[PDB]
Amino acid sequence: VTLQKFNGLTVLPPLLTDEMIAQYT
Amino acid sequence: KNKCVNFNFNGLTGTGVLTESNKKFLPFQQFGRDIADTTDAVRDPQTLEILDITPCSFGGVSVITPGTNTSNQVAVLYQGVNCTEVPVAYSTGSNVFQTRAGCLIGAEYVNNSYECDIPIGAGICASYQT
Amino acid sequence: LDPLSETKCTLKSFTVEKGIYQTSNFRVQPTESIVRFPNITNLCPFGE
Amino acid sequence: VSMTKTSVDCTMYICGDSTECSNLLLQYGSFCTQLNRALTGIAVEQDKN
Amino acid sequence: LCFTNVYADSFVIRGDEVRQIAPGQTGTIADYNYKLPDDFTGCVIAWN
Amino acid sequence: IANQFNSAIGKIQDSLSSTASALGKLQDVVNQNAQALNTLVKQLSSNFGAISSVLNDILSRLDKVEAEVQIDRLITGRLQSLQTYVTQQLIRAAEIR
Amino acid sequence: QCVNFTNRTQLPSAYTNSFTRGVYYPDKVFRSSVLHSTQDLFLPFFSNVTWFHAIHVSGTNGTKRFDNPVLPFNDGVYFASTEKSNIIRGWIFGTTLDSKTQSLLIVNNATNVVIKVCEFQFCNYPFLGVYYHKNNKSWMESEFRVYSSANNCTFEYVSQPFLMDLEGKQGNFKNLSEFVFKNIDGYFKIYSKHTPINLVRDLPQGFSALEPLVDLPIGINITRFQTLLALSSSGWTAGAAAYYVGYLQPRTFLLKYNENGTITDAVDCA
Ligand SMILES: *[C@@H]1O[C@H](CO)[C@@H](O[C@@H]2O[C@H](CO)[C@@H](O)[C@H](O)[C@H]2NC(C)=O)[C@H](O)[C@H]1NC(C)=O
Ligand SMILES: *[C@@H]1O[C@H](CO)[C@@H](O[C@@H]2O[C@H](CO)[C@@H](O)[C@H](O)[C@H]2NC(C)=O)[C@H](O)[C@H]1NC(C)=O
Ligand SMILES: *[C@@H]1O[C@H](CO)[C@@H](O[C@@H]2O[C@H](CO)[C@@H](O)[C@H](O)[C@H]2NC(C)=O)[C@H](O)[C@H]1NC(C)=O
Ligand SMILES: *[C@@H]1O[C@H](CO)[C@@H](O[C@@H]2O[C@H](CO)[C@@H](O)[C@H](O)[C@H]2NC(C)=O)[C@H](O)[C@H]1NC(C)=O
Ligand SMILES: *[C@@H]1O[C@H](CO)[C@@H](O[C@@H]2O[C@H](CO)[C@@H](O)[C@H](O)[C@H]2NC(C)=O)[C@H](O)[C@H]1NC(C)=O
Ligand SMILES: *[C@@H]1O[C@H](CO)[C@@H](O)[C@H](O)[C@H]1NC(C)=O
Ligand SMILES: *[C@@H]1O[C@H](CO)[C@@H](O)[C@H](O)[C@H]1NC(C)=O
Ligand SMILES: *[C@@H]1O[C@H](CO)[C@@H](O)[C@H](O)[C@H]1NC(C)=O
Ligand SMILES: *[C@@H]1O[C@H](CO)[C@@H](O)[C@H](O)[C@H]1NC(C)=O
Ligand SMILES: *[C@@H]1O[C@H](CO)[C@@H](O)[C@H](O)[C@H]1NC(C)=O
Ligand SMILES: *[C@@H]1O[C@H](CO)[C@@H](O)[C@H](O)[C@H]1NC(C)=O
Instruction: Write a three-state SS string for E23-42.
Output: CCCCCHHHHHCCCCCCCCCC
G143 close to ligand 4 (CB < 6 Angstrom):
no
Ligand 10 atom at shortest distance from the alpha carbon of G152:
14
Do D and F share at least 3 CB pairs under 8 Å? yes
CA pair distance F79, F60, nearest whole angstrom? 23
Rounded to 5°, the CA angle G245-G248-G250 comes to 170
Domains, chain G, with CATH or none:
14-270 (2.60.120.960)
Q: Report the largest interatomic distance among the alpha carbons of chain A, rounded to a whole angstrom.
A: 37
Handedness of CA F60, B32, A8, F30 (dihedral sign): positive
CA pair distance F40, F76, nearest whole angstrom? 14
CA pair distance G190, C15, nearest whole angstrom? 69
CA pair distance F71, D15, nearest whole angstrom? 10
In angstroms, the Cα distances linking G235 to E28, G5, G59, G238 are 69, 9, 19, 10
3-state secondary structure of B97: strand
Rounded to 5°, the CA angle B81-B85-B88 comes to 130
* Residue G63 contacts residue G69 (beta carbons within 8 Å): no
* CB-CB neighbours of G22 under 10 Å: 28
Asked if G259 reaches chain B (Cβ–Cβ under 8 Å), the answer is: no
CA pair distance G265, G208, nearest whole angstrom? 8
Rounded to a whole number of angstroms, the distance from the CA of A1 to the nearest CA of chain F is 6
Q: What are the beta bridge partners of residue G155?
A: G117
Rounded to 5°, the CA angle G233-G237-G240 comes to 135
Is B76 buried (19+), middle (13-18) or exposed (0-12) by CB count in 10 A? buried
Handedness of CA G215, G219, G225, G227 (dihedral sign): negative
G143 CA to middle of ligand 4, Å? 13
Rounded to 5°, the CA angle B47-B53-B58 comes to 145
Residues with Cβ within 8 Å of B105's Cβ and at least 6 positions away in sequence, in order, are B75, B76, B77, B78, B86, B90, B93, B95, B96
3-state secondary structure of G60: coil
SS (H, E, C) chain F: CHHHHHHHHHHHHHHHHHCCCCCHHHHHHHHHHHHHHHHHHHHHHCCCCCCCCCHHHHHHHCCHHHHHHHHHHHHHHHHHHHHHHHHHHHHHHHHHC
Compute the residue count for chain A: 25
G66 close to ligand 9 (CB < 6 Angstrom):
no
* CB-CB neighbours of G206 under 10 Å: 12
Q: What DSSP assignment string belongs to G125-179?
A: EEEEEEEESTTTSSEEEEEEEEEEEE---SEEEEPPP---------SS--EEEEE
Rounded to a whole number of angstroms, the distance from the CA of B121 to the nearest CA of chain F is 19
Residue of minimum CA distance from atom 5 in ligand 5: G260
In angstroms, the Cα distances linking F5 to F8, F15, F16, G187 are 5, 15, 17, 74
Asked if B24 reaches chain G (Cβ–Cβ under 8 Å), the answer is: yes
* Residue G95 contacts residue G113 (beta carbons within 8 Å): no
Phi then psi for residue B51, to 5 deg, are -115, 130
B84 CA to middle of ligand 2, Å? 9
Residue of minimum CA distance from atom 3 in ligand 5: G260
* Residue G269 contacts residue G253 (beta carbons within 8 Å): yes
Handedness of CA G26, G30, G31, G32 (dihedral sign): positive
Rounded to 5°, the CA angle G34-D10-B54 comes to 45
CA pair distance F50, F52, nearest whole angstrom? 5
* Residue G94 contacts residue G119 (beta carbons within 8 Å): no
* Residue G228 contacts residue G43 (beta carbons within 8 Å): no
DSSP single-letter state for residue G24: B
* Residue F67 contacts residue D20 (beta carbons within 8 Å): yes
Report which of G257, G205, G206 is spatially closest to residue G26, judged by C-alpha positions. G257
Q: What DSSP assignment string belongs to C28-48?
A: PPP-SEEEE-PPP-----TT-
What's the resolution in A?
3.8
Compute the residue count for chain C: 48
CA pair distance G145, G105, nearest whole angstrom? 13
Is G80 buried (19+), middle (13-18) or exposed (0-12) by CB count in 10 A? buried
Residues with Cβ within 8 Å of B3's Cβ and at least 6 positions away in sequence, in order, are B17, B18, C31, C32
Rounded to a whole number of angstroms, the distance from the CA of D27 to the nearest CA of chain B is 23
**Ligand 8 interacting residues, C-beta cut-off 6 A:** G 15, 48
User: Left (φ > 0), alpha (ψ -120 to 50) or beta: where does G224 sit?
Assistant: beta
Residues with Cβ within 8 Å of G18's Cβ and at least 6 positions away in sequence, in order, are G43, G44, G45, G46, G47, G49, G78, G203, G244, G246
Q: What DSSP assignment string belongs to A9-24?
A: EEEEPPSS-HHHHHHH
CB contact under 8 A, D9 and C25: yes
CA pair distance F52, F54, nearest whole angstrom? 5
Rounded to 5°, the CA angle G199-G204-G209 comes to 135
Q: What is the arrangement of strands in the sheet containing C19-27, beginning at the earlier edge strand?
A: B96-99, B102-105, B75-79, B58-65, C19-27
User: Left (φ > 0), alpha (ψ -120 to 50) or beta: where does G35 sit?
Assistant: beta
Nearest CA in chain B to G211: B28
B76 CA to middle of ligand 2, Å? 22
Nearest Cβ partner for B31 among G28, G34, G211: G28
B98 close to ligand 2 (CB < 6 Angstrom):
yes
- Give the HSE-up count for residue G234: Cα atoms under 13 Å, Cβ half-sphere: 4
CA pair distance G246, G23, nearest whole angstrom? 13
Q: Which of residues 208-237 of G touch B (CB under 8 A)?
A: 211-212
In angstroms, the Cα distances linking F93 to B12, D5, D42, F33, G83 are 39, 10, 7, 10, 64
* Residue E23 contacts residue F65 (beta carbons within 8 Å): yes
Rounded to a whole number of angstroms, the distance from the CA of F51 to the nearest CA of chain D is 16
* Residue G89 contacts residue G229 (beta carbons within 8 Å): yes
G167 close to ligand 5 (CB < 6 Angstrom):
no
Rounded to a whole number of angstroms, the distance from the CA of C12 to the nearest CA of chain B is 14
Nearest Cβ partner for D8 among A8, A13, A16: A8
B17 CA to middle of ligand 2, Å? 17
Nearest Cβ partner for B60 among D7, D16, D47: D7
Residues with Cβ within 8 Å of G1's Cβ and at least 6 positions away in sequence, in order, are G143, G144, G145, G232
CA pair distance D22, F93, nearest whole angstrom? 30
G156 CA to middle of ligand 10, Å? 16
- Give the HSE-up count for residue G76: Cα atoms under 13 Å, Cβ half-sphere: 22
CA pair distance D26, D16, nearest whole angstrom? 14
Report which of G180, G176, G178, G179 is spatially closest to residue G248, judged by C-alpha positions. G180
Residue type, G45: F
Handedness of CA E10, E11, E12, E13 (dihedral sign): negative
CB contacts, 8 Å: D40 with chain C: 22
Phi then psi for residue D24, to 5 deg, are -70, -30
CA pair distance G153, D22, nearest whole angstrom? 49
Do D and C share at least 3 CB pairs under 8 Å? yes
How many helices and strands (H and E) does chain C possess?
1, 2
DSSP single-letter state for residue G17: E
Asked if E36 reaches chain F (Cβ–Cβ under 8 Å), the answer is: no
* Residue G8 contacts residue G234 (beta carbons within 8 Å): no
